Amino acid sequence: AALVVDNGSGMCKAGFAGDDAPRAVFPSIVGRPRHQGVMVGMGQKDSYVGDEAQSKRGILTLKYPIEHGIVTNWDDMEKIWHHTFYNELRVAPEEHPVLLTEAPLNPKANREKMTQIMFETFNTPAMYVAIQAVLSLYASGRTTGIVMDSGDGVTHTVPIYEGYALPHAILRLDLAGRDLTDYLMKILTERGYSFTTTAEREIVRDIKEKLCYVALDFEQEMATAASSSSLEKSYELPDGQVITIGNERFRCPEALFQPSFLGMESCGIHETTFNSIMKCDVDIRKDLYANTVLSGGTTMYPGIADRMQKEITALAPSTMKIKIIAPPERKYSVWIGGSILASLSTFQQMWISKQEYDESGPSIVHRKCF
Amino acid sequence: NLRSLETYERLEADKKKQVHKKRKCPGPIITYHSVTVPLVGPPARCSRTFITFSDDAT
Amino acid sequence: QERRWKVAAAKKLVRTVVRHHEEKQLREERGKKEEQSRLRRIAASTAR
Numbered sequence: 229a230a231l232v233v234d235n236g237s238g239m240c241k242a243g244f245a246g247d248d249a250p251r252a253v254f255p256s257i258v259g260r261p262r263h264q265g266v267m268v269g270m271g272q273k274d275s276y277v278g279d280e281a282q283s284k285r286g287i288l289t290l291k292y293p294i295e296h297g298i299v300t301n302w303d304d305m306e307k308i309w310h311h312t313f314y315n316e317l318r319v320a321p322e323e324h325p326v327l328l329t330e331a332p333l334n335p336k337a338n339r340e341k342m343t344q345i346m347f348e349t350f351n352t353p354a355m356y357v358a359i360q361a362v363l364s365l366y367a368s369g370r371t372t373g374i375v376m377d378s379g380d381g382v383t384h385t386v387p388i389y390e391g392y393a394l395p396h397a398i399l400r401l402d403l404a405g406r407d408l409t410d411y412l413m414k415i416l417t418e419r420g421y422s423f424t425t426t427a428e429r430e431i432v433r434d435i436k437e438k439l440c441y442v443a444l445d446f447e448q449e450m451a452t453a454a455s456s457s458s459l460e461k462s463y464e465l466p467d468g469q470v471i472t473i474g475n476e477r478f479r480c481p482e483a484l485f486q487p488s489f490l491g492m493e494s495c496g497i498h499e500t501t502f503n504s505i506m507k508c509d510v511d512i513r514k515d516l517y518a519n520t521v522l523s524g525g526t527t528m529y530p531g532i533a534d535r536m537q538k539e540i541t542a543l544a545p546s547t548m549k550i551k552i553i554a555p556p557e558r559k560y561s562v563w564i565g566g567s568i569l570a571s572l573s574t575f576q577q578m579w580i581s582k583q584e585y586d587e588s589g590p591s592i593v594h595r596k597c598f
Numbered sequence: 599n600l601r602s603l604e605t606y607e608r609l610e611a612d613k614k615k616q617v618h619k620k621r622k623c624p625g626p627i628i629t630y631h632s633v634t635v636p637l638v639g640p641p642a643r644c645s646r647t648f649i650t651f652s653d654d655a656t
Numbered sequence: 657q658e659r660r661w662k663v664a665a666a667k668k669l670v671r672t673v674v675r676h677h678e679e680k681q682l683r684e685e686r687g688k689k690e691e692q693s694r695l696r697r698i699a700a701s702t703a704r
Contacts, residue, residue, distance in 0.1 A: 390703045391700060392700070574624055653701070654694060
């Protein structure tokens with residue numbers, strides 16, 4: 229079975245093609261000891277990856293090799309791939325093809341480096357690169373539409389026509405779950421709850437993922453929160469202290485629609501999607517409006533689909549049919565799409581073989597992957 | 599309820615989309631196509647032929 | 657006659673060179689568009 233590896237800015241998902249869910253999901257982080265001298269002598273590993281690094285966050289320095297969807301540390305990315313294959317999947321990469329995902333607008337040099345690493349370091353028999361948004365569209369049984377992908381580090385809107393992403397209309401927004409977590413930390417500090425440590429940052433992330441939601445009408449929700457405490461929810465901290473959260477539940481995710489909350493002059497996700505659709509040909513805009521698929525972990529907020537529908541209906545012409553598609557398992561849409569793609573019998577001829585790499589070099593990836 | 603009722607009443611749309619498909623089985627295909635096109639400098643018309651190949655190999 | 661022939665031959669050769677370079681440039685541009693269309697075709701087949 230071919231291996232599918234989703235290279236996400238916050239979480240890495242890996243599994244076997246044909247499965248309905250990834251087998252391993254762990255943070256894409258590499259940890260190194262803060263004080264080498266004392267701890268090297270006692271046989272301690274030089275670096276920790278994924279869950280092991282997260283569990284030792286009190287003594288390790290954590291670094292992300294992927295920033296805003298772009299690989300910035302190739303050594304750490306190689307270490308993450310090694311950890312995935314030998315610790316998470318426990319398989320020999322030389323015996324199984326590997327399908328890798330890439331962010332939109334991925335530099336050609338990065339694709340060549342990925343191909344070189346996969347063929348020379350892991351001796352993989354075959355490999356394929358697929359666009360995350362394209363896989364997200366594939367996971368929903370659609371081939372023409374626009375995918376709004378918002379992960380941990382970056383948000384992209386990608387219009388796709390018959391499986392082909394339109395590069396001239398792809399828009400990038402440097403706003404995602406991490407910025408929302410920092411904003412929640414700031415507003416909780418403004419309410420009186422101080423979170424300063426990385427452990428407290430992860431507590432704030434858990435609070436965001438468990439209690440935040442998107443309001444249909446921000447002004448009406450603010451008036452309701454100012455007039456009644458019915459929207460306040462309690463969260464029990466690990467030390468037993470119970471904190472009360474009020475309007476922060478919906479003010480934090482509102483930053484996705486109004487980046488001005490963070491001081492950013494960029495357009496919201498709805499305006500970004502509308503602008504991306506407006507950059508496409510008029511004949512395909514009708515298909516794009518009717519096939520807007522939400523993907524990514526940052527799109528898991530309850531009510532986001534209704535708000536997106538309302539905003540697009542208010543922005544799009546009244547004669548256009550608007551339909552927002554929000555799959556329940558949209559956080560795994562990329563991996564599911566990759567598993568579907570790698571499970572097709574016709575796709576077995578699309579794999580880049582080691583012979584083709586040896587004959588054409590790393591540039592074959594640009595003539596085989598789209 | 600309409601979607602529920604359509605479990606019985608959606609006789610039209612589903613059958614039309616399942617029967618009048620615009621695609622066929624995988625593999626190489628050569629499409630001969632001939633349509634009426636209007637002449638340029640019923641209206642004046644001429645016939646024109648297009649030949650379409652599924653893949654670059656064929 | 658030799659002068660007329662040399663002038664005409666020079667014009668012939670230079671216009672052939674100019675057309676040769678025009679053809680090469682247009683062939684490169686058409687190749688780029690062909691590569692784009694090829695990638696689009698592969699995407700369409702996968703979508704099908």
